[PDB]
Structure formats: structure tokens, C-alpha cells
Design a protein around this ligand. Structure first.
Ligand SMILES: COc1cc(C[S@@+](CC[C@@H](N)C(=O)O)C[C@H]2O[C@@H](n3cnc4c(N)ncnc43)[C@H](O)[C@@H]2O)c([N+](=O)[O-])cc1OC
Ligand SMILES: [Mg+2]
Ligand SMILES: [Mg+2]
Ligand SMILES: [Mg+2]
Lengths: 408, 404
């Protein structure tokens, strides 16, 4: 068969849980930076579908550039005022026109309209209390490039792309208790099920987890929607209702740790200086956002784990090696961590320029073994998983386009 | 104070088999955005100080660069579509005179737009700011809640948010090579000698064992190269200079230097620019996409995702703690017995900036040294810095530290 550049090594260090400290952050769906990542990736997905429908392949584009300018608002118990809309600028580049010299024809594609529509539909989905007709302006300066039909023909072969570069991706698994608690706290508080029970909870949620030994302090920033709280008393009730939900979640998935929960810690209840919003996001006035300043593709910010600085959101899922490798590294690590005997796993991938993207210069697998396991019994299974995913790298591309994996 | 010191027993970065490090130089679009953002904050600080004797709330850590278009040509090309730059962020836009019962507007927008143009003029020798660039401004008023926290103790300020900064020391050989290569090639002395060198220089260092491969993407300014031959001569002249640098600071390593590797001499298709930045080529930028405050991008080191550039130097811990962690790590690495030091600092929103929720220190010890002998010394350093935390603000305002 085929031999790739895969390295497996035993990593003989303390695993993450046994280290004394951990810090983990997540910017939730309605956080201005996360809004920008989500729009960036939504626009790419929409363009991919546009290209697939017309040509049966995906053409060059990158929409990993989105700027969110905070609006103007005046929150008030019982329902505040949205004064000036949130301004969002879409940027990047996308293939717009195909020049066919053989036929005497030009094909033009709906790049700008597709982008603006995709952005608006994304905001509609995730921001329950934002009226996208009146509360948002979506502007577009996405570059519109041209391309020869003959190069479209080549792309329609849908062969495995060549790496154009020496690029790097890194991932790991499993998530620690603290990581899982931070991730699932945000996910739960932004789930439809919680919203329906406590509509006052906005989507701009930020969760910080500090572990000291076996004590996890969770600090939650949570935008409250002011039409659902008539006074400071009802605001407090919302905080305490959430505090209890999060307590129950901590019992469910971090049993055995001491968990301490703090919510909206900059509040001053008595002065009524609290985290009230009209729309459920501080994008309405308090804060601004842009792409690549938040969660990594695993959904977390983790200064005790290796992190890539590349912004995956909005990059071409068909040719951008960095995006594909950071996602792939995460997927491979996740499967290797499910193997019997693996306590902890790191996967690093480095491309070989001029070579197919599933023929990397190096793919390094670091494994912390459980007690009484031999790295050499695990290695064959681990290499098989890595080779499985590399064989199916085009499947990964498809998963990105269909939104089956996360970019933030 | 919540200071925590731990021994860290892992392989030191220099001894690991592989290292990858990157620096986005001054004229790279992402770095243009970081530097503009910080320029705007510095100018607003000065304006607020002039009018009120104090810095008012702002955070202009938002700048979006939309690439323009150009037509490079040997001996000098021309710009075709202007680079569009949007200044954004929060700022104190107005003051309420409760006596007159009138709103008074502050010159935020004029100050911001001028600061941005002056910064661009500083870093891009060959840009024409009247023709090649559009600078727009949509900075807006921040929420009153954040303004109150800002004012409550702006003696020792309260932390604006719950965030963390990170820093480490010392730099590895590969990190220093990458950092100093960019700094040298964008030094005034070098560009005076080789004016064909544009400021958009991206340097990536890949170490494998004792081999360091340096990949450089360097914009060449087309008014200073009359033909393809002169272009080649610039490449080889820069190459020689970097070789000499690598002999100085990477002694004992095999260093390969690769410059502008996508060049196609057969088709005369090379990295030529009119302005010295890829921003003219449709490439985009925004803030916090690039270097950390130590000037580097390092996936083999801890990083904070906070973007220091443009954040206010009074109470934004995303700026202050990233600088502070670097200062602390640097001093601890000086200690005999410390091989590597990692510092992570976490705030709690509303608490004084010199009362972090956690100030976390990890130390890889030199062989045979006891962390027990080191711990007290490390703690003292961290406490000394927390005692002197207003020096951070002062160093930042005086322009004595970098934010990227
Ligand atoms: C942590 O405290 C507070 C923290 C913040 C920080 S937000 C950004 C700071 C910056 N854009 C600024 O100009 O102030 C950044 C993020 O913090 C969250 N946030 C916004 N308002 C908040 C609030 N009232 N309380 C807690 N978190 C909030 C939200 O997720 C935002 O994206 C604010 N604030 O700027 O109005 C204001 C607070 O209030 C003192
Ligand atoms: Mg942000
Ligand atoms: Mg970039
Ligand atoms: Mg931050």
C-alpha cells in the first residue's frame, strides 16, 4: 500500500488533569468575535454551495475577514431602545467571473448578493432578539476575481489538492474536565431548551474556567435581554435561576470537583449598574468584533494547550492547507484518544509544498499512555486512524461545507 | 496575592525536535492594522490628557484593511484601486455638561484619522496616502457600564474584564532569529542601503533538529528595480545579509534561507509591488491576527488570544497583563537555575488590576537546581511587578514597549 510520514511517540509527562492549574475560555455564539467567525464561515459555505451548483466543484475564495462595529442602544427594564444599527462589513475575495475563450462567453456568479444573504440568515438563526431588518447593516467589499474556464475544467477533476506551502495544524484529545465544563456551559446556556425556559438569557455569553487543584471557578458573562426583566428584582432572579442550572450541569459532568460559579461579576445591583441589553448581545453598543480573535476550531481558548494563530473561519475548505490541517488534527486526535490505553494525545501536521495535502512532510502523534499499556501496542491502531483520515481528506472538506465540523 | 509557582517537567523547547515560528513584519496587512490601532489609542490618550489631564475610556482595537489593487512595473508601477481602511472601536465621543444641559462633542474622529495616516506614512516609505489609501472611521460611544468601571478608581484601576495574558522567557534560537531577521530588514539603516526592500516582510522559521529553514516573503519596491536582473540582485543581497545575521545569533545551527519562493523568473512573475505592501494586491488585514506582544507567532509556546493593540493602557487587562506577563517572565529567566519560565495572569472583572485572580508561574529548572530555592525568588519578582504595575501603563504610553 502507501507509506506516509507518520511518527508515533510516547510522551512521558504528567497529563493535563494532574497538572495543578488550568485556564480555559470560550466566547459564545452571540459574542461579537464569534459572530464574526460564524458569519465568515457561513459566507464561505454559501459560496461553496453556489460554486457546486454551477460547476460541481469549489472555486477559490476566502471570506475570513468580517468587521463588526458596535451600534448604539439604551437598555431599560421592560424593554430598551436600539438607536443605531450594528454595522457589519464583509471582506475577503471570491471568484466571480469565468472567462471562456473557446465559447465566446462569460459566466458571472452572485458573489456579493450570496454573501450578504448568508450573513443575514446566520444572524437571524443565532440572535433571537435582533431584528435583522432594522438592527443590522450588512455591507460588502468582497473582491470579485476572474478565472479562465480552462482552469475551472482542471478544478472539476476534483483531484486531491497540492499543498502550495509549508503550513501547520495542531490538535489534541480528550478534553479535560475543565475544558468540557466551559464548553458545555456555553452550549447549554445558548441551547433552545434553556432559552425557552429563561428567555431573558441573551446569546452573548463568555465563560472563563480556572482550575486550581480540584477547584474549578467558572466566571460567566451573560447578556440579559431587557424586555424580559421588569426591574432589578427580576434581573437578580434570572442570575440565580441560571446559577442553579449551571450548578446542576457541574454536578453532571464535573462530579468530584469543587465548582464555584460567578455570574456578571461587574454588576452593582444596588446602583442598578447591570448587564442589560436590548438585543442580547453587547454588539449592540458595548463591544466590537472581528475574525480570528476567539475560539480555536475545537471551540476553546486554551493557554495550557498548543494553539495555532490562524483563523480557520472563512478560509477555502478545498485548498487552504492551514484550515484543513487544524480541523484534521482535531479529528485524528479525537479518534486516537478513544483507543484503549491512550490517556492524552497531541497531533501535529506539517505540509509538503508541491505534494498532495494528504501526503504531509510530517504527521507527529504524541501519546501519554495509561498505566500498564505499551506504546507499541497502541501505535499500529493510531497510525491506522491517521491514515484512514488522510485517505478520506476530501470527506473532511465535504464535512466543512456541510457544517458538520466546527471552525470556532 | 494569588501567586502560584510550579516546577514544569517537560522537554525544553530548544531540545525538542521541531519548532515553527512566524513573524508578520511591519508592512504586512495584519501588522498594519495592529500598528494603526495602537497609534489611534496613543493619539486619543494624548488628546484626552490635553483636554482633561486624564485618559478617558476607549478601546480602538479594531481596524479592518480591505486590500486595493495595483499594476507593478519595473522602474515604477501605479496604484489602480485604493486600499480601504476602516477605523473602529469604542471611545468617549462626547461629554454631558449637566450645567448647560448640553452635549459636548470630543474630536475623536479627526484625531483617529490623522493618527492612522501618520502611522502609515511612518511605516510605508513608498505609499501615497492621498491616492493609495482611503481611511474611514466608525468609532462609537461605549456602554456606560464599562465607563463607570473605568472611572471608579482610575489611584489603581479596576480590571475591565475577566481575561488572561501570557508571557515566557527566554526566546529560543529560532525565535530570536525570526524576530531579528524582520527587525533588521525593516531597520532604517538597511532600507537606506537597499531601498528596493519593502516593509511587508513575513518571516517563518522551521527548525528540524539543528537545521533552521528561514522562509522570507519580502515585497520589493518596483521604482528601485529597473529590470529582472536588478530584482535578483536585491534578493541575493538581502540573502547574504541574513546569512551574516544567522552566523551571529544562530552559531552552531545549519541555516537555510529561502526568499520569495513563489517567484517565476521564466515568466518574469515575481514579488513586485508599487507601495511595498501586499495590501495593494487584494490582501486583507485585521487586528489581533498576527504577532503576540513579544513580536512572534509561536504554536510551540503558550499564547493569549487577546489583541493588545489599540486597547486602553489604563484598565484593559488584555493589554496590561500580556505586557506584565512578559516583563515578569523575562526577569525570572535571569535567575540562575531557571531554564524556561511561563507566566499566565488571569483577572477578575471589577477587581484592581494588581489583584489578579491568579498569577501562574511555571519553571523548567536547570539540571540539579531545586524549585524550592527558586520559588521564593520568582514570587518576589512577581510581587515587585504587581507593586509597580502603574509602570506598565507608563511604559505603554511612553511607547517603550511593543504590542505586536
Ligand atoms: C466584565 O465586565 C465588562 C466587560 C466589558 C468588556 S467588552 C469589551 C471592552 C471594550 N470593547 C470596551 O470598549 O469597553 C467584551 C465582552 O465582555 C462582555 N460584556 C459586555 N458587557 C458586559 C457587562 N456589563 N458585564 C460583563 N461582561 C460584559 C461581552 O461578551 C463583550 O463582548 C464591558 N464593556 O466593554 O461594555 C463592560 C463590562 O461591564 C462592567
Ligand atoms: Mg474581542
Ligand atoms: Mg492575515
Ligand atoms: Mg479579550
Amino acid at each position: 500500500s502507501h507509506m506516509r510520514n507518520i511518527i508515533v511517540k510516547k510522551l512521558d509527562v504528567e497529563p493535563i488533569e494532574e497538572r495543578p492549574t488550568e485556564i480555559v475560555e470560550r466566547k459564545g455564539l452571540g459574542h461579537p468575535d464569534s459572530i464574526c467567525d460564524g458569519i465568515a464561515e457561513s459566507v464561505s459555505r454559501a459560496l461553496c454551495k453556489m460554486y457546486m451548483e454551477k460547476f460541481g466543484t469549489i472555486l477559490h475564495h476566502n471570506t475570513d475577514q468580517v468587521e463588526l462595529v458596535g451600534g448604539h442602544a439604551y437598555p431599560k427594564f421592560g424593554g430598551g431602545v436600539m438607536v443605531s444599527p450594528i454595522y457589519i462589513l464583509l471582506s475577503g475575495r471570491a471568484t466571480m467571473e469565468i472567462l471562456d475563450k473557446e465559447k465566446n462567453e462569460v459566466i458571472k456568479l452572485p458573489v456579493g448578493t450570496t454573501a450578504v444573504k448568508a450573513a443575514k440568515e446566520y444572524l437571524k438563526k443565532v440572535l433571537r432578539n435582533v431584528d435583522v431588518d432594522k438592527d443590522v447593516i450588512i455591507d460588502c467589499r468582497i473582491g470579485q476575481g476572474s478565472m479562465d474556464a480552462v482552469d475551472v475544467f482542471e478544478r472539476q477533476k476534483n483531484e486531491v489538492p497540492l499543498a502550495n506551502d509549508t503550513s501547520f495544524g495542531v490538535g489534541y484529545a480528550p478534553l479535560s474536565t475543565t475544558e468540557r465544563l466551559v464548553l458545555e456551559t456555553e452550549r447549554f446556556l445558548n441551547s433552545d431548551e434553556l432559552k425557552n425556559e429563561i428567555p431573558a438569557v441573551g446569546e452573548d455569553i463568555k465563560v472563563m474556567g480556572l482550575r486550581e487543584g480540584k477547584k474549578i471557578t467558572l466566571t460567566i458573562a451573560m447578556a440579559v435581554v431587557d424586555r424580559y426583566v421588569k426591574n432589578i428584582e427580576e434581573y437578580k432572579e434570572v442570575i440565580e435561576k441560571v446559577r442553579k442550572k449551571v450548578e446542576d450541569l457541574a454536578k453532571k459532568i464535573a462530579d468530584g470537583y469543587e465548582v464555584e460559579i460567578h455570574i456578571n461579576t461587574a454588576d452593582d445591583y444596588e446602583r442598578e449598574s447591570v448587564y442589560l441589553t436590548v438585543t442580547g448581545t453587547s454588539a449592540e453598543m458595548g463591544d466590537d468584533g472581528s475574525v480570528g480573535r476567539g475560539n480555536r476550531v475545537n471551540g476553546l481558548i486554551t493557554p495550557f494547550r498548543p494553539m495555532s494563530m490562524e483563523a480557520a473561519s472563512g478560509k477555502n475548505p478545498v485548498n487552504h492547507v492551514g484550515k484543513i490541517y487544524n480541523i484534521l488534527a482535531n479529528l485524528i486526535a479525537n479518534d486516537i484518544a478513544k483507543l484503549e490505553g491512550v490517556k492524552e494525545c497531541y497531533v501535529r501536521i506539517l505540509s509538503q509544498a508541491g505534494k498532495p495535502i494528504n501526503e504531509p512532510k510530517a504527521l507527529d502523534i504524541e501519546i501519554i499512555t495509561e498505566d500498564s499499556y505499551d506504546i507499541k501496542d497502541i501505535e499500529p491502531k493510531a497510525k491506522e486512524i491517521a491514515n484512514k483520515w488522510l485517505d478520506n481528506i476530501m470527506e473532511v472538506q465535504k464535512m466543512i461545507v456541510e457544517g458538520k465540523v466546527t471552525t470556532f
